[PDB]
């Protein structure tokens, strides 16, 4: 009826766990949260010096945190169970963290863990980096398939398929953005990946869609997938391609992580590298007042279409008084950058704004990326646990009427100090060749992906963070939704309590996604919150998974 929890009569004995540990060649880990050094029981590992080092970067996406077996990055899902900022005498508890972690070395480890979990009625969790904003990579009382260490990279000079011919990279499931970029750069190529360097490229990133500053040139991450190597729920080690287990390939390419199969690697398109044009472009209200500022943002938005259609992108911060943008202009030299920027600069000029404009040309993509989103290799990307999103259709922006509503939404969010400023990315991803995939159609009509993100506050109460959580899901996200009809919520950047997840994340694709889910996982061994087919499991008050 329900998944077993620590404390249950039916929880596996330590002998059961040892027997799994043997099968796994010693690769079972009992979860000990990284902040156990900040507490006294039950791990008896208290260390004030090490506790203090954890504090200064805890709210950053760091390699240190990503390297922990059972930790996730979300302060909200940590949920004060074993964190560096509570009383030392407060017991270091697992809470939402999995009980045991399978340190996966290949297909056999997964097959073993799946057999064990199915024999013993244990919840499977899948964790790669722990970046998930929706907690989809933790679970109380769970055995976790920890994919972080599957780091193999393989350059394929001449991938040969009817629908793709050219360079490709086969990447293990734990390969992170910075690893993918180092690997692609060394061969004279670019790969489509996230702006946050520590993000797992093969994980929930590509599986859930995956936007990039390179998307205007090469589509979303999932568009660039050639092959998925997987283990299915019943333990079959398979390869999914457009011409083999194609329905699984379709679901995995934009249908979301952690529900269809356990991914061991992906093979993806590489693209020839070269000169990359870049800029800082910033403007504020200090000379024109706030009203002209918001009209200038409205106009900046309206001016994107031709810039994006030329293969370029803007990633930018929208504040209450200033906008700061970083431009990505692949293959553009300095004269080309200038011509590309001239419409935006003329618009600001006509509105009495003196922008901050800092154009450059990088030799390669890697250099461009880490100039703007560094430092290399890990970056410095803050973790905001109340991340929401809207994919905003081009047609909304290009009509002044509907664009006014878009602008008015951004003004409203700018008044909410925990959610301001916020980042947007801009892209054109229609009419590029890619295989059939399950990527939400709003991506094709979309021009903006904006992520209003609420920071965590270690001085605030738990009740205040819980209130911020409910605010994001039931007030801020629906306000965003209503202001942008025909758009959608990016499944990777949403709140776990957001009520309209099914329609907004998946849309009309959902029936077919559900058919694929029932084909490859008929017993629903894979569960993630807001995942395809997740409505099979209820989460009770204590956090136990029970069959709906
Ligand atoms: C934390 C963070 C996230 C970001 C950042 N920047 C992004 C950007 O510029 N563009 C984007 O499109 N997305 C950005 N994201 C979000 C990530 O795209 C999502 O948060 C992804 O879900 C991240 O995936 P991953 O790195 O794998 O993190 P996990 O929490 O480990 O997994 C998420 C999800 O996927 C399942 N899963 C992962 N790996 C597997 C394998 N191998 N097999 C099966 N299932 C897998 C997990 O179960 C979970 O459900 C910038 C920042 C700072
Ligand atoms: C942080 O930890 C607390 C536990 O201290 C979690 O609170 C629990 O949250 C769930 C869902 O919000 C509550 O379940 C609800 O129970 C009622 C019956 O009482 C049921 O009718 C509802 O449908 C729902 O399932 C639960 O009561 C609550 N428990 C307590 C003690 O507050 C919280 O979810 C954790 N936060 C995160 C982000 O993990
Ligand atoms: C599962 O098996 C391995 C057996 O080696 C355990 O890993 C060892 O853990 C001890 C601590 O007790 C360390 O001192 C060693 O470094 C590890 N062994 C080796 C050979 O390196 C692991 O702890 C076991 N886990 C569980 C949950 O039973
Ligand atoms: C998870 O498993 C991997 C592979 O068994 C471990 O990687 C080894 O770690 C040691 C350092 O402790 C290195 O000297 C070896 O070169 C690594 N082996 C391989 C094949 O990469 C990894 O340390 C384990 N991690 C945890 C947290 O248990
Ligand atoms: C990227 O690759 C080139 C050769 O392809 C190499 O010379 C250069 O050092 C690399 N850059 C970085 C920053 O690793
Ligand atoms: C606003 O823009 C002006 C002119 O570009 C610049 O000098 C100034 O530093 C900016 N102010 C803020 C607060 O960003
Ligand atoms: C902005 O705020 C007003 C007043 O609170 C509200 O009525 C309106 O719906 C909001 N506008 C948008 C575009 O969401």
Residue numbers in the entry: 27 to 574
What text comes from the article?
In the present study we report the discovery and the structural characterization of two novel flavoprotein oxidases from the thermophilic fungus M. thermophila. VAO-type proteins are composed of a FAD-binding domain and substrate domain. In both MtVAO615 and MtVAO713 the cofactor FAD is covalently tethered to the protein by covalent linkages.
The crystal structure of MtVAO615 with amino acid residues 27–574 was solved in two different space groups. The structure at pH 7.5 contains one monomer while the structure at pH 5.0 contains two monomers. Rcryst/Rfree are 19.5/23.5 and 23.6/28.0 respectively. As already observed by SDS-PAGE, MtVAO615 is heavily glycosylated, showing electron density in 2Fo-Fc maps for N-glycosylation at Asn47, Asn105, Asn129, Asn211, Asn310 and Asn438. As expected, MtVAO615 harbors a bicovalently linked 6-S-cysteinyl-8α-N1-histidyl FAD while MtVAO713 has a monocovalently linked 8α-methyl-N1-histidyl FAD. The isoalloxazine ring of the cofactor is covalently linked with the C6 atom to the Sγ of Cys222 and with the 8α-methyl group to the Nδ1 of His157 in MtVAO615 and His159 in MtVAO713. The groove shaped substrate binding pocket of MtVAO615 is solvent accessible and contains, besides His157 and Cys222 which tether the FAD, Tyr159, Thr221, His237, Thr341, Tyr352, Leu399, cis-Pro401, Ala402, cis-Pro403, Ala408, Phe410, Thr413, Tyr449, Asp451, Leu475 Ala477, Ala479, Glu519. In particular, Phe410 and Tyr449 seem to create a sort of funnel. No other suitable reference dyes could be obtained. These observations indicate that the redox potential of MtVAO615 is extremely high for a flavoprotein, around 120–160 mV, which is close to the values reported for other bicovalent flavoproteins.
